[PDB]
Design an enzyme around this catalytic site. Sequence first.
Site, mmCIF file in Angstrom:
data_model
loop_
_atom_site.group_PDB
_atom_site.id
_atom_site.type_symbol
_atom_site.label_atom_id
_atom_site.label_comp_id
_atom_site.label_asym_id
_atom_site.label_seq_id
_atom_site.Cartn_x
_atom_site.Cartn_y
_atom_site.Cartn_z
ATOM 1 N N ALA B 56 1.997 16.077 5.516
ATOM 2 C CA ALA B 56 2.248 15.899 4.080
ATOM 3 C C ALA B 56 2.693 17.200 3.430
ATOM 4 O O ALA B 56 1.943 18.177 3.378
ATOM 5 C CB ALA B 56 1.009 15.364 3.388
ATOM 6 N N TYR B 182 -3.068 8.946 -2.878
ATOM 7 C CA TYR B 182 -2.337 10.021 -3.534
ATOM 8 C C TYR B 182 -1.434 9.402 -4.607
ATOM 9 O O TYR B 182 -1.654 8.253 -4.980
ATOM 10 C CB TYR B 182 -1.576 10.845 -2.499
ATOM 11 C CG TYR B 182 -2.523 11.444 -1.471
ATOM 12 C CD1 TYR B 182 -3.533 12.323 -1.859
ATOM 13 C CD2 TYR B 182 -2.435 11.107 -0.124
ATOM 14 C CE1 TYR B 182 -4.418 12.869 -0.928
ATOM 15 C CE2 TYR B 182 -3.316 11.650 0.815
ATOM 16 C CZ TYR B 182 -4.302 12.520 0.406
ATOM 17 O OH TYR B 182 -5.177 13.045 1.341
ATOM 18 N N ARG B 325 -5.312 12.589 16.169
ATOM 19 C CA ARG B 325 -6.361 13.513 16.599
ATOM 20 C C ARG B 325 -6.316 13.816 18.103
ATOM 21 O O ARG B 325 -6.613 14.941 18.509
ATOM 22 C CB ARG B 325 -7.739 12.970 16.204
ATOM 23 C CG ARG B 325 -8.072 13.245 14.734
ATOM 24 C CD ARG B 325 -9.267 12.449 14.217
ATOM 25 N NE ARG B 325 -8.987 11.015 14.231
ATOM 26 C CZ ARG B 325 -9.873 10.082 13.901
ATOM 27 N NH1 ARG B 325 -11.102 10.428 13.539
ATOM 28 N NH2 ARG B 325 -9.534 8.797 13.947
HETATM 29 C C1 FNR Z 1 -6.081 16.775 10.585
HETATM 30 C C2 FNR Z 1 -5.655 15.467 9.910
HETATM 31 C C3 FNR Z 1 -4.773 15.588 8.843
HETATM 32 C C4 FNR Z 1 -4.239 14.426 8.252
HETATM 33 C C5 FNR Z 1 -4.558 13.195 8.773
HETATM 34 C C6 FNR Z 1 -5.645 13.061 9.646
HETATM 35 C C7 FNR Z 1 -6.088 14.201 10.300
HETATM 36 C C8 FNR Z 1 -7.058 14.078 11.469
HETATM 37 N N1 FNR Z 1 -3.751 12.042 8.394
HETATM 38 C C9 FNR Z 1 -4.046 10.730 8.968
HETATM 39 C C10 FNR Z 1 -3.369 10.663 10.355
HETATM 40 O O1 FNR Z 1 -1.968 10.689 10.233
HETATM 41 C C11 FNR Z 1 -3.797 9.433 11.170
HETATM 42 O O2 FNR Z 1 -3.474 8.239 10.479
HETATM 43 C C12 FNR Z 1 -5.302 9.474 11.468
HETATM 44 O O3 FNR Z 1 -5.718 10.694 12.051
HETATM 45 C C13 FNR Z 1 -5.700 8.321 12.390
HETATM 46 O O4 FNR Z 1 -5.055 8.395 13.631
HETATM 47 P P1 FNR Z 1 -5.845 8.994 14.942
HETATM 48 O O5 FNR Z 1 -7.052 8.126 15.212
HETATM 49 O O6 FNR Z 1 -6.276 10.395 14.584
HETATM 50 O O7 FNR Z 1 -4.868 8.958 16.084
HETATM 51 C C14 FNR Z 1 -2.614 12.176 7.490
HETATM 52 N N2 FNR Z 1 -2.043 11.082 6.991
HETATM 53 C C15 FNR Z 1 -0.896 11.231 6.272
HETATM 54 O O8 FNR Z 1 -0.324 10.252 5.893
HETATM 55 N N3 FNR Z 1 -0.409 12.491 6.014
HETATM 56 C C16 FNR Z 1 -1.050 13.581 6.438
HETATM 57 O O9 FNR Z 1 -0.618 14.684 6.211
HETATM 58 C C17 FNR Z 1 -2.302 13.401 6.982
HETATM 59 N N4 FNR Z 1 -3.113 14.567 7.330
#
Ligand code: FNR
Lengths: 359, 359
Positions: B56, B182, B325
């Site tokens: 983001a 957001y 993650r």
């Molecule tokens: C460190 C971190 C940072 C963010 C996120 C999560 C995490 C762990 N996620 C959500 C991410 O894109 C994703 O949808 C989730 O982490 C779930 O997927 P996983 O289970 O982690 O594979 C996220 N979502 C988004 O739309 N923009 C972003 O910048 C963020 N930033």
Amino acid sequence: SALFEPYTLKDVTLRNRIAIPPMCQYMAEDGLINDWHQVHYASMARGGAGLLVVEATAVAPEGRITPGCAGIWSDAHAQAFVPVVQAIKAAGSVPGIQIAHAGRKASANRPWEGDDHIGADDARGWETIAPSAIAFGAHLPNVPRAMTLDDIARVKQDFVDAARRARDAGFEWIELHFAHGYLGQSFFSEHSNKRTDAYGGSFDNRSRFLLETLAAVREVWPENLPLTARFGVLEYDGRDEQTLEESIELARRFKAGGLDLLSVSVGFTIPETNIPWGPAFMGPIAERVRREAKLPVTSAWGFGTPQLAEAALQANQLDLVSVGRAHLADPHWAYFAAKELGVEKASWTLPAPYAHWLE
Amino acid sequence: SALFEPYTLKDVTLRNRIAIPPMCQYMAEDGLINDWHQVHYASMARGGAGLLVVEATAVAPEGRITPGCAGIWSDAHAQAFVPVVQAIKAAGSVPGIQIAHAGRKASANRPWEGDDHIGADDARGWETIAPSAIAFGAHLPNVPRAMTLDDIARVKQDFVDAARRARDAGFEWIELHFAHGYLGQSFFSEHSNKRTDAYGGSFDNRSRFLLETLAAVREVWPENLPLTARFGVLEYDGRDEQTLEESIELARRFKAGGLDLLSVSVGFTIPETNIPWGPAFMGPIAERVRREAKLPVTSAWGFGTPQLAEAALQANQLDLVSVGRAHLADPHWAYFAAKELGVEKASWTLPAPYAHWLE
Ligand SMILES: Cc1cc2c(cc1C)N(C[C@H](O)[C@H](O)[C@H](O)COP(=O)(O)O)c1[nH]c(=O)[nH]c(=O)c1N2
Ligand SMILES: Cc1cc2c(cc1C)N(C[C@H](O)[C@H](O)[C@H](O)COP(=O)(O)O)c1[nH]c(=O)[nH]c(=O)c1N2
């Protein structure tokens, strides 16, 4: 976990016992490293390993293994390492470098491009040098030029210059590459060294290039930073008991010459061998060197299974566990090992932007 | 393996179905990315994922979540992304970026530094803006300023400028951040939007900010590059069937407005919810959106288990599987997945200097 105990050697403290051993990337150009190396090394350092030894870096152009090998034979080459050094430090790891000369194994193709000696019609090739004019054989058939006393003096000075450059680039740990059949190893081995002067024949003479190179480097490398070497202590050539005995004696002389730690390996001096590859197969050899030469050691081959790394430390077979290919597979292997061994707050093996989300 | 089939959307072809979704690193300074991001993104791209969507990235300073969030609100900010774009491409992955405005969730601490709204007495904070002067609550108690019509015009133009900058920086894939509570999500939701002008009340009015922003971005974003959005299609707030119906209708309107793919997520608009967290729990919802709105989709949460990723694709729940993650844990997760799913020559998911040795 023994694997995650800190380690202090001279003025350097490693945050754990995980070392990333030197691993050639074959991605440099005219010896200059680039963005391949920058990301490669920074990512692994962020992964949690306490020590990162940069790949075999040539002290002279003809000492590269391949046209893709890193070099440090000029100040420009050394300056190229500064961002690598600083990124490793920024990650909380300690930056080391292995300085090297490939000897008769030089002028070879990259491993995925034939892995063999470069053809004589190929413009990329160069004349190789060695203690004696005898080829490795097999896929490395090129006969090297036998070094003169002047060559020996020049190569020693190249190692000295390289160590000075490594110091100024900010490396905190240096490793002399006296293993794996390259120049230093090939001076020690009777297979490859048929010299009749002061540098061949007897044990003293075969040891001489290695001891003189160490001594010359010792003069310019800071006393407060670890001075180490990698050395193949046996060949699995049917001469193992005698060869181990001699190699261990040489390790005693290395210690008498100011060596702080020995990376224990295999010679790979000739192809006609029978190496008993297996997980942690070097563990008992490393333990014997550690105990008999009374010197800290590391070793490698198969320690990517975290339980094996932990067991080797608990048995006092080594002081640091070198984990190579597992870090190519997973640059965050140290984190993986922390989880596997049940380390408290294992995710904080990694930096906060990862650790926060993985706990 | 379905996971390793290529995917073509507009003029862009992804080498497999693995997408790294946007993940905030909170390591930027004044919106400018740096060496943290350079190594972070380059390493994951080399890991094998076919698509890497950068975190983001705020279209305006007050649209950052935190003082560490990336920004693209000037040409200098955009230029800072160019080395990241180049590194992702050089690795054979496709560079995308999520452009964003945090709305009422803005002016917050980094997650490992409290994760809460910055206090008024703390000069690092700033006034937040939203459709209406209503706080999220819980750990985000700051009441946002209700946007003026001029604010609405300005923020739309900031999205346009951000999209123009992303285009000129070389990104090949854009994602509008209309999810996770957001600014965009908060215009759509009746929880957060109490406006009585053209931008609140009816379904058409609540949709208006999102549709107008999409249309304005569509004018500057190339037709031949995927134009995508992330959108929370339900809240788990006891209003799920009604909210899903409306959200899917808006997705139909996105499609009519030139949207190429929808990243299907959860609203996170308010804290008073009951999300049934579990492995691949979004699969059925993503499938319903895909089928009913007739748009390609991706989704996330728990797909780091390679068999789950594979199963979701074979069930046609998703077109791309987002794995977040697991890539923080292991930047080479795509290679791990190739091995696990028995892909032929799995090691060549990675570049040659790794692949050669991991066969
Ligand atoms: C460190 C971190 C940072 C963010 C996120 C999560 C995490 C762990 N996620 C959500 C991410 O894109 C994703 O949808 C989730 O982490 C779930 O997927 P996983 O289970 O982690 O594979 C996220 N979502 C988004 O739309 N923009 C972003 O910048 C963020 N930033
Ligand atoms: C890609 C690559 C490149 C090299 C190596 C190997 C590999 C895989 N190795 C040997 C390495 O340090 C290590 O001893 C072996 O890889 C065995 O340890 P692992 O089983 O991989 O943990 C190595 N050894 C060395 O002394 N200098 C080096 O530059 C190289 N280069």
